[PDB]
Amino acid sequence: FNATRFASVYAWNRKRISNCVADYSVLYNLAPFFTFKCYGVSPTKLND
Amino acid sequence: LCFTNVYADSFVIRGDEVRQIAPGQTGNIADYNYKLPDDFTGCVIAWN
Amino acid sequence: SKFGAISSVLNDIFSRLDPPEAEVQIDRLITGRLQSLQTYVTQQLIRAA
Numbered sequence: 001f002n003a004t005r006f007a008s009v010y011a012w013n014r015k016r017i018s019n020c021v022a023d024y025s026v027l028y029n030l031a032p033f034f035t036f037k038c039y040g041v042s043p044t045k046l047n048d
Numbered sequence: 049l050c051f052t053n054v055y056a057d058s059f060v061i062r063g064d065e066v067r068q069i070a071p072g073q074t075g076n077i078a079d080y081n082y083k084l085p086d087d088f089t090g091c092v093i094a095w096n
Numbered sequence: 097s098k099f100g101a102i103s104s105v106l107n108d109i110f111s112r113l114d115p116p117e118a119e120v121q122i123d124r125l126i127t128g129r130l131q132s133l134q135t136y137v138t139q140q141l142i143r144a145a
Contacts, residue, residue, distance in 0.1 A: 042076040072114035086115040
């Protein structure tokens with residue numbers, strides 16, 4: 001989320017994540033107003 | 049059969065969240081918007 | 097003893113499941129343990145006689 005440059009849309013990046021503890025709450029401090037659409041899971045119940 | 053009194057509550061919710069309107073369920077809507085008792089009796093009608 | 101249920105721990109059943117089928121599991125547990133208590137009471141009565 002704090003990278004200097006992002007990859008182009010056609011050559012979109014792919015990152016694998018495993019064996020880690022993820023705190024998604026920090027993702028609410030990115031911008032005062034931003035889209036946070038989630039499919040198949042409620043965002044407020046991602047910490048359980 | 050007939051009843052003592054009837055309460056009708058109507059609103060509009062997202063498509064994925066329609067399963068959260070049920071006794072004992074948890075999530076954003078169940079916890080922060082609308083909670084049903086465990087020993088609930090009555091019906092729910094949801095249409096697009 | 098599980099008495100045919102998934103788990104033999106009552107509060108485990110409470111925490112790990114929603115009320116709908118947790119009620120069935122607890123019903124099974126209570127019936128089994130009550131039957132065991134009744135059997136023990138009958139044995140005690142016979143021995144007392």
